[PDB]
């Protein structure tokens, strides 16, 4: 009888949202529906384009029910407030969405409450102004959750999906596979933070005040994460956006999506995570996440930059190109904070910078660099959390070792209470793989210096891709 | 240094309405004056304009209904960071 989606997000051990308020920007809603009556406040804010009744409020009503519905909702408690930015045809404007976001911020300033979650179950093409407004609202301390988009395309080409600091959610089905429907389906790629149930999702139907209907979409998926976030923020109201994102990743089901569904180049970029509620088991723990940059593009001196949130530390930095035409990567300071920078090679199509960003308070971290030797070595003379290497040439023990013609960089942290170890694995090979042990957190992933495309952490597994390769994982714990 | 942007997905563009985004610390009083200035400069050129909304609190700026003919003029206004043509969003 439990809807498949609500079971799916239930953790393997278990035992809401009322201190939190969830704003919904959507079609009009049937607020007297019994799933949500008394739980959704209609603001009567409205900014919608002209057209060009049951149908008018179907989308919004269903999603209010996914978030907060008394029988089929994720956060059955939660208070919601709704703004109307989509017309009867499900169409809105960028300007209308901006005015809506601005209305939420003004409301907050006039009558402050607790943590706010804003669900944006909508998408248009990439928009500079919409992304900037989202970013600004996130920096003001509001959590934003948005749909990845339903076009079976790269979510970075859409807004607010592509918007920095917003939690972007793709849709998976009952078999934990990405939703597809011909040329249509869940978006994917590096702007998606995680997936959540978004096919065959039962919820309030505006056909009648007690009716239910199954609907599909990345908005339904996003509504699950909005619900989960509201619950997480009720339990731990002081969470920063970066702490909340790290928990959502950490409590997700991992490696359950078959990545064959995605286009080949998007597989490495797309997180293999399906959202879940935190377990009754939660005592400090080391949380890390992998942050892929935008592709640098093909310019000879091109660089890609991957950054961490202000309250995170960059513990390592890697890079990847599909061709292998690569000059590696280095950690460089920038506004007094370390970023991961990767360098394209001459004639390369471009590269990605790949940061490992971790929540490590009281850490004092530095970088130790050695320029090319005649091989090259550097050590934390402190625990080593990461090795990087870059070169300027066209071709060839708390210690990092690089090529004799390359610079080598060690990330060294003073982190009392932190234990780290290094695990190596090598074989004759398109891909070699080495995983940290359960309860340990991968902080760094690199290849021992036959032609490597790059290296990247996937959860707590270090992956090395080549065209006698040895993967090296640095693993730490409290 | 002010730049123009519109939706790459051509069917989703909504020409004739523009979001004028001003530089980060621009004050509401300045946004309002910049809007009136655009309308005055436009009217002298024979163009009707309508200021639909003045933004403050997240981004400073304003929403204006006008011919795209005026974009070169608008990009030269004081405080302008960039201008974006309005476009469609859709239930997902």
């Amino acid at each position: 009888s439990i809807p498949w989606n609500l079971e799916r997000i239930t953790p393997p051990r278990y035992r809401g949202g009322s201190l939190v308020e969830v704003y919904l920007l959507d079609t009009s809603i049937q607020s007297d529906h019994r799933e949500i009556e008394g739980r959704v406040m209609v603001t009567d804010f409205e900014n919608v384009p002209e057209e060009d009744a049951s149908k008018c409020d179907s989308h919004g009503t269903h999603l209010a029910g996914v978030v907060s519905g008394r029988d089929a909702g994720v956060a059955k408690g939660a208070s919601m407030r709704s703004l109307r930015v989509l017309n009867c045809q499900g169409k809105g404007t960028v300007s209308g969405t901006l005015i809506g976001l601005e209305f939420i911020r003004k409301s907050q300033l006039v009558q402050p409450v607790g943590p706010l979650v804003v669900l944006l179950p909508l998408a248009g093409g990439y928009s500079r102004v919409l992304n900037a407004a989202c970013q600004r609202l996130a920096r003001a301390g509001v959590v934003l959750v948005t749909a990845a988009g339903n076009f079976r395309d790269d979510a970075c080409l859409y807004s607010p999906a592509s918007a920095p600091e917003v939690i972007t959610v793709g849709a998976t089905n009952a078999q934990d596979q990405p939703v597809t429907l011909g040329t249509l389906g869940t978006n994917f790629g590096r702007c998606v933070d995680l997936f959540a149930p978004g096919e065959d999702i039962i919820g309030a139907s505006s056909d009648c005040s007690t009716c239910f209907v199954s609907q599909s979409g990345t908005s339904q998926a996003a509504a699950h994460v909005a619900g989960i976030a509201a619950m997480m923020l009720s339990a731990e109201p002081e969470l920063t956006l970066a702490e909340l994102r790290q928990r959502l990743i950490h409590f997700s089901a991992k490696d359950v999506i078959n990545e064959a569904w995605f286009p080949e180049d998007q597989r490495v970029l797309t997180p293999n995570l399906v959202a879940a509620l935190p377990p009754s088991t939660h005592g400090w723990q080391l949380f890390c996440r992998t942050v892929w940059s935008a592709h640098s593009g093909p310019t000879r001196m091109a660089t890609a930059i991957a950054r961490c949130a202000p309250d995170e530390e960059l513990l390592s930095c890697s890079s990847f190109s599909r061709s292998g035409k690569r000059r590696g990567e280095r950690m460089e300071a920038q506004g007094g904070k370390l970023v991961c920078r990767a360098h394209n090679a001459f004639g390369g199509e471009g590269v990605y910078a790949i940061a490992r960003c971790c929540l490590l308070p009281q850490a004092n971290c530095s970088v130790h660099t050695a320029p090319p030797a005649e091989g090259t070595r550097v050590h934390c003379h402190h625990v080593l959390t990461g090795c990087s290497s870059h070169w300027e040439v066209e071709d060839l023990p708390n210690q990092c070792v690089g090529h004799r013609e390359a610079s080598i960089h060690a990330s060294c942290c003073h982190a009392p209470g932190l234990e780290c170890k290094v695990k190596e694995h090598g074989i004759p090979q398109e891909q070699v793989t080495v995983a940290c042990e359960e309860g340990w957190t991968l902080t760094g992933c690199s290849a021992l210096p036959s032609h490597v495309l790059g290296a990247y952490a996937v959860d707590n597994t270090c992956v090395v891709r080549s065209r006698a390769v040895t993967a090296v994982a640095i693993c730490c714990r409290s | 240094t002010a730049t123009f942007h519109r939706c790459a997905k051509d069917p989703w563009r909504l020409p004739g309405t523009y979001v004028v985004v001003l530089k980060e610390e621009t004050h509401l009083s300045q946004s309002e004056r910049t809007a009136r200035r655009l309308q005055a400069q436009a009217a002298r050129r024979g163009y009707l304009t309508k200021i639909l909304h003045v933004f403050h609190g997240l981004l400073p700026g304003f929403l204006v209904k006008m011919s795209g003919d005026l974009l070169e003029l608008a990009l030269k206004l004081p405080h302008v960071d960039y201008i974006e043509e309005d476009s469609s969003v859709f239930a997902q």
Partner: peptide, 10 residues
């Protein structure tokens, strides 16, 4: 897959 969800037919 309902028509109220862009871009499904509905």
């Amino acid at each position: 897959f309902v028509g109220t969800t862009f871009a499904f037919e509905x």
